[PDB]
Design a protein around this ligand. Structure first.
Ligand SMILES: NC(=O)c1ccc[n+]([C@@H]2O[C@H](COP(=O)([O-])OP(=O)(O)OC[C@H]3O[C@@H](n4cnc5c(N)ncnc54)[C@H](O)[C@@H]3O)[C@@H](O)[C@H]2O)c1
Ligand SMILES: NC(=O)c1ccc[n+]([C@@H]2O[C@H](COP(=O)([O-])OP(=O)(O)OC[C@H]3O[C@@H](n4cnc5c(N)ncnc54)[C@H](O)[C@@H]3O)[C@@H](O)[C@H]2O)c1
Ligand SMILES: NC(=O)c1ccc[n+]([C@@H]2O[C@H](COP(=O)([O-])OP(=O)(O)OC[C@H]3O[C@@H](n4cnc5c(N)ncnc54)[C@H](O)[C@@H]3O)[C@@H](O)[C@H]2O)c1
Ligand SMILES: NC(=O)c1ccc[n+]([C@@H]2O[C@H](COP(=O)([O-])OP(=O)(O)OC[C@H]3O[C@@H](n4cnc5c(N)ncnc54)[C@H](O)[C@@H]3O)[C@@H](O)[C@H]2O)c1
Ligand SMILES: Nc1ncnc2[nH]cnc12
Ligand SMILES: Nc1ncnc2[nH]cnc12
Ligand SMILES: [K+]
Ligand SMILES: [K+]
Ligand SMILES: [K+]
Ligand SMILES: [K+]
Lengths: 462, 464, 461, 460
């Protein structure tokens, strides 16, 4: 076809990827419903979307939905280990520029993002951004400000990326408006919680094949990811302990039946080894970080962990674990891809039968995507139906074309209206075969809602 | 204790010593509430407060009452439900010299009389200046029947979802006369009391009323809000096969993901009024139906006619009109098994065969079943709710809304929630009561996620 | 003019009858037997001494035995387990019953004796139904001439079966017995799932404590310990399990529980120093489930976290050293079957003392003492087995056999698997469950009959 | 060394890394290595072994070798081998013939390669079997080899049934130990192993969300119990079918609805007997019975579009896959995952929506689409296997006089004391602490402080 504008691991995997895409379409009714609803309208005609998000089968269905609605895209993954190579191949073989493979180096990861930004060595005529984690958003602001003049908006997938957007807005450096896709309930309380419930124990089993029942786990964090992670391990029969800095989230962990503990004596992290609860950490078989924070599994914790404990991170970035300390001081033995034994006996060489090692999964990167396939299609359906609606909304607002006085009034980080959140949810429920009841007019009046919704005030927490 | 004290009405004063024993146990189970008592007793922040209180007269409410008194308040108290009082709790409070008008098993006339006995003292309006309410009934009577009393009242602190809804409707219509705090929507209330409380107390009440095995049987929970979520878990953890109905697709999505089948009592979810719209095949398999919605007529007459023989029917929302019990009083014969447990014989109105097989079992005559057939939420859960109530009372009493000039009053006539910092401090005391240890952020960590080391840790938009 | 009974309050009979009528609808296996055998009257001529918790469920059992032709004289096998409305309804029906909630030990003994004697002389009993062995022991020690005419004993529970097997081992057992406990529709229904239902039930009724998020220690992980551990874990407790049997301990681990010992390295040497004080100081609730003696001992009780709840769901109260607590500590009754035990001394207590334990049912069977025991639909299985066991031994007529034939039949046996399966089928039908029927080819393939039994006798389920 | 056949010998280093890890996960098995290494109780044993050539089986093999045995090994299923485990064993100089993805013919050839060495019957004297295929081949094709064999140790429920049938028929030639019915096997492996590995295999094959979907589990024995839990703990709405009313009672009490694919449970052969409304709602069916044709052709026709079909019993005939080969078009998604298009036999529309997903072609799905049970669970089964091999080999049945052989030809289980000793090592691997009875407490309950703590009739 003459198409060379891509870079994947193995284009010959395209047929396999296409078979899995066709299966995933049947698992994604909200996203496929949007394809059918908007195909004739072509609401993304003229949109040119820079996309940076895990190049999985689920992302493939998202891409082809955007394209079916009229958009053009240039795509990269937002993590070096999260691509499914057959997914990237199917997208490239469909004539869609994608630069992504499993097991990129840091230099290749940056090169891939740059290949979406540049076409034929010059800035692509981008006018929309879809991001997961804020890396593409950051590169555009620091390196390509002239490109942002013509971009109508950013739709950001995940908690960490939203935080970075809010920091830019606070400092007055955000250049285009954004939709916080993370905080739709059909994203945050579906993807972040239930997705990790499905995919955490999945990745741990694929990486180690360890029995989990009867063993001791420590989950650092009890937000949406930490809630789902803790359920992922508890439902397998693990004895799960939970750590938290937010006493409200800790209260939920208690009421949910977990013991709440701190790696530090009386919870005080003063940087000394004496502050580490060695008795507690010496009994832990598995530690999982879920925070989006820095260094919540630190060097002294790693030194105190029970021999042969598994260490992994399911937050967005690998700096939740002090893997730099481990690269500097301990010998790494690869078991298989994305599974390393870290030998605490020294830096130079190891004994093949040493018993004093840790098992690190995905080199500390997002373990569900690194060691398995991330969240399943039916969960990602909710997140990516929101993504498509967010893209439609900002592209139709046409921020880049507004006068400066109107731009100032629209430069914000917003969420989708609750009515749309509900409409995504209903398609998900129908996908399960669920039957929602319709309010009578008197019942709708009694609780103060329209029969068709929205059904809750914007303050409702679900 | 006070000599000659007669300003109360309870079922049995001889239960007071028993009630006091249970209050002393409950104090050990309520560290947030008792922490406020220790912290603020010397300051006496409620000195001069005269609180009208209307909330279920349980042992837990007793600990709330005596905390308010310990901080300087005078109170006059009634229950907000005819079946929810624990008579030993009411007796202990009356024996302490605190005016309380409450017993288990009031008539509706007695229920209204009890509220009016708090409102009046010696035949005339008490000089109340604060209101604590659970469901809005006391709020409604004051606005409807004693509007002049509201000229002296600084605020209302409302406990529960239904009460807040009524307050918001009044605010929208310009009929709310004093500011209010929505205690319900603290996270240490709504996502503790409403959910976890019902998880503890729903299966408790069904067991006490019926002693039915729940494992292996079929349940239908109407609603999947906070109460519906907790109720569904109460039954699923006993091994019930639980189906969930909802009108809200987001809540229905959560029910699916939580492992429940989502179904409607009506074919295709459409109630067209007729019996033909009822999914008779579904309802004929249900052993237990629980209403959790705060809405009206969500278990209606046609559903009751279609239910499986000998199914249990109950309501854990605030008001009994979730179930059309009036239809059942009109058409079917009631056989009392024991207090708050009735067999409802679908064979006819007049008599019943003592061995008739075609009956339903109704708990608490459709009133809040956890309080009607058991003791409601446990002390350690009510700790969170009632710590919020005390902080709410202190805040509004200190604001002195009734002493403001008319212009400044319109600026503060609002329904507010407590700030998140206080929500967190309540949660911290609850966690410590479990022996949990919260970790402290390092300065670099707190900078990294953009919070203070002391909190708050989440933006107000966070849903937990 | 029926006076041959003693209950708390006969005016509770109408209430008891209402609850019996409900329970009948919850007990399809047992009522199925009532309907199937009523015309045949297989227990005509049976005269049954019965000793088992005088609950509503036992009421349905008694009236099934009577409906099948038997006469009975009844007592409870525990001082706190009677439901007074059940005893009243049975008495009001003209059935001799001696039972009330809150008996003294002297009254408990007197109640059993009133079943044994009628008009001051031995009743013409010829069958025994027992739960725990107390009636069986009194007959063997005190009324051997009565045992000469008794055809058999049907024994409900693990502890009573152990006592039977000891008698058989020693050559002191005088009549054959059926071990009803070890039907699968009893042991793996009643002992396990019944305790799942009623343990957290009784703890809530006695204390109204929140259980979610608190620390529990369950002593034992047999059938009762398995059901009890699930009762607490499903409420959200953090449950630790102790065991002496490493196979049961392995099951606890695989079921997601941490297995711990009250004693350092598991060595119970009798010293305070052997107590894992750090462990015991974390426990909010301890439950004993063993059928053994002193598995929650004085040194454990001294080390428990302040305000912990202590209770026992095994047959006898000696699982807990309550005698030590009576001797050393002050007891404050909260309400019936709930006591605070003040560890500050024996001579009085401060009403606001913080150093106390809460003891449920004075250490007696807590599900029956503080609630209503197992629910009717679970007891359906146990009591259908009891009825079938009574029929089997009564029809065998052991007492009428020659001495040489008695020696060949003096044993402790279980009911056959086909009966166990038929009880299970009625239970499943009560839930609306639909069992599949094997085709001839499938039955041939796995080597069973289409009607069962479906498993070899060695199968453990 | 050339006496082996595996997929890729260069995987040996990888397999060896995973064996070193597995050793740390198998305390009972490694404890037997340490305690019997001095005695060498299997010196002189020549063991024919036929069981899934996994990493876990590699630790079993090297334990038998560490205690003195020679072995020749094959897998007992065409899809269960882990190629890196087989390579590590071959690279250790141990004859093994096994790879993932064998044909039926290759599977038989592999068993024959253990039986024969240099074109002649090996001088085998012990048999270790999982499912009875090797046992059957020896009896039917190499009966004279059985005159030198001291015993068989059989792993699984289906193989035990086959052994009992031969004993009843007078065709069993050597004594056997039923390893399945140790509690540390049956009530650990069969139940908890499937709890770990069923949802594992379904995720690896389909990556389907399981929460909120409907499952039908056929059977509720030990495998059906663990399978049902594997699905329910993920949030599936699980229904259970059973022919055994006692097992069905357990399913009800465990919180499951008990249903039959057939109206009133009567499987009369007609489409009319199928409960089409029930089957049309099922997203996943799992067979666990060890029986034949429990997911039959009419059920397959009635299933909800895009339902997943799989089998975790020993043999693939639980599902009528022959019917589907005969009538419907198979589209391979990836190895051991096939879409079966119900539109017809010859060809399919790539976008057809009327298909079912079959995992592992109906073969044991946990080993076919994942890695079977985890090391810490297989520890219990394989410690029992080692002990049973030691017992039968030391009994030396083949060397006994005829009348002594008649008294010794039986199928037995290991004593409870050994069962408990395996369990103790497993418990210690979790860090659990077993309490020791006092002498008074032991006397009170009528046991020895040493145990056994339960009568042989106890069901746990
Ligand atoms: N892997 C996935 O599929 C996936 C999915 C969604 C989100 N994420 C990422 O996971 C991270 C968390 O997301 P979220 O939505 O759960 O955020 P969140 O804000 O809901 O939760 C994070 C939690 O970590 C806690 N925490 C912070 N510092 C801590 C510390 N030092 N010790 C203990 N707890 C601490 C916070 O109190 C908070 O409750 C983000 O990086 C997000 O982008 C990953
Ligand atoms: N008994 C208790 O202890 C207790 C405790 C807290 C609250 N409550 C009461 O329970 C009620 C519910 O409170 P909540 O906090 O859960 O409110 P909520 O708003 O969180 O949930 C109510 C749910 O009912 C659903 N619903 C409404 N009409 C419906 C219908 N026709 N069919 C199906 N679902 C329907 C709504 O969509 C909503 O999700 C209120 O009356 C509240 O005051 C009782
Ligand atoms: N309350 C009820 O409703 C009810 C119901 C059934 C049985 N029971 C009684 O409960 C008791 C147990 O019955 P079961 O069927 O579970 O018996 P079981 O033999 O199955 O289990 C008892 C367990 O206790 C363990 N054990 C013994 N001593 C121990 C110690 N010192 N520390 C820890 N664990 C120890 C044993 O290893 C055994 O596994 C008996 O007294 C029985 O009669 C009560
Ligand atoms: N894949 C694995 O890892 C693994 C592990 C252990 C055993 N197995 C195999 O799994 C199978 C089952 O083993 P088990 O130990 O559970 O045996 P089991 O005897 O304990 O259970 C089989 C159950 O299937 C039921 N059943 C039989 N026919 C039925 C039908 N037509 N419909 C419904 N239910 C029916 C029986 O009543 C029985 O309860 C055997 O083939 C065994 O070898 C596999
Ligand atoms: N499967 C998936 N695809 C894309 N983004 C994801 N985030 C988590 N899981 C994912
Ligand atoms: N309800 C009950 N009736 C009789 N015996 C019992 N044992 C346990 N629960 C019982
Ligand atoms: K996926
Ligand atoms: K209460
Ligand atoms: K009962
Ligand atoms: K494995």
């Amino acid at each position: 076809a003459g198409f060379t504008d891509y870079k994947v691991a193995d284009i010959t995997l395209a047929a396999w990827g296409r078979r899995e895409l066709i299966i995933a379409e049947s698992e994604m009714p909200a996203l496929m419903g949007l394809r059918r609803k908007y195909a004739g309208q072509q609401p993304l005609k003229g949109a040119k979307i820079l996309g940076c998000i895990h190049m999985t089968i689920q992302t493939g269905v998202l891409i082809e939905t955007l394209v079916a609605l009229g958009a053009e895209v240039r795509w990269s993954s937002c993590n070096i280990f999260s691509t499914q190579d057959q997914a990237a191949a199917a997208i490239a073989a469909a004539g869609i520029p994608v630069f992504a493979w499993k097991g990129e180096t840091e230099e290749e990861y940056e090169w891939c993002i740059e290949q979406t930004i540049l076409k034929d060595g010059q800035p692509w005529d981008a006018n929309m951004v879809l991001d997961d984690g804020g890396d593409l958003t950051e590169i555009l602001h620091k390196k390509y400000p002239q490109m942002l003049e013509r971009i109508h908006g950013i739709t950001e997938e995940t908690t960490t990326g939203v935080h970075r957007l809010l920091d830019m807005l606070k400092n007055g450096t955000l250049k285009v408006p954004a939709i916080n896709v993370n905080d739709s309930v059909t994203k945050s309380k579906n993807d972040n919680k239930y997705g990790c419930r499905h995919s955490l124990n999945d990745a741990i089993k694929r990486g180690t094949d360890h029995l989990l029942s009867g063993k001791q786990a420590l989950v650092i964090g009890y937000g949406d990811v930490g809630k789902g992670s803790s359920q992922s391990l508890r439902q397998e029969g693990m004895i799960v302990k939970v750590a938290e800095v937010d006493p409200i989230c800790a209260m939920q962990a208690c009421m949910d039946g977990f013991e709440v503990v701190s790696p530090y004596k009386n919870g005080i992290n003063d940087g000394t080894e004496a502050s580490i609860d060695a008795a507690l950490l010496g009994k832990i078989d598995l530690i999982v970080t879920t925070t989006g924070n820095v260094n919540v599994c630190d060097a002294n914790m790693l030194k105190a962990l029970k021999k042969r404990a598994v260490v992994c991170n399911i937050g967005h970035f690998d700096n939740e674990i002090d893997t730099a300390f481990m690269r500097k001081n301990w010998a790494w033995e690869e078991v298989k891809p994305q599974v390393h034994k870290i030998h605490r006996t020294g830096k130079d060489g190891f004994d093949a039968h040493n018993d004093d090692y840790l098992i690190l999964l995905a080199e500390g990167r997002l373990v569900n995507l690194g060691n398995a396939t991330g969240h399943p299609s039916r969960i990602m359906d909710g997140s990516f139906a929101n993504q498509v609606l967010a893209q439609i909304h900002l592209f139709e607002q046409k921020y880049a074309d507004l006068p400066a006085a109107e731009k100032a009034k629209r430069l914000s980080v917003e969420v989708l209206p609750k009515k749309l959140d509900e409409e995504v949810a209903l398609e998900m429920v129908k996908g399960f075969g669920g039957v929602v009841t319709q309010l009578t007019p008197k019942q709708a009046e009694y609780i103060g809602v329209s029969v068709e919704g929205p059904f809750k005030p914007d303050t409702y927490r679900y």
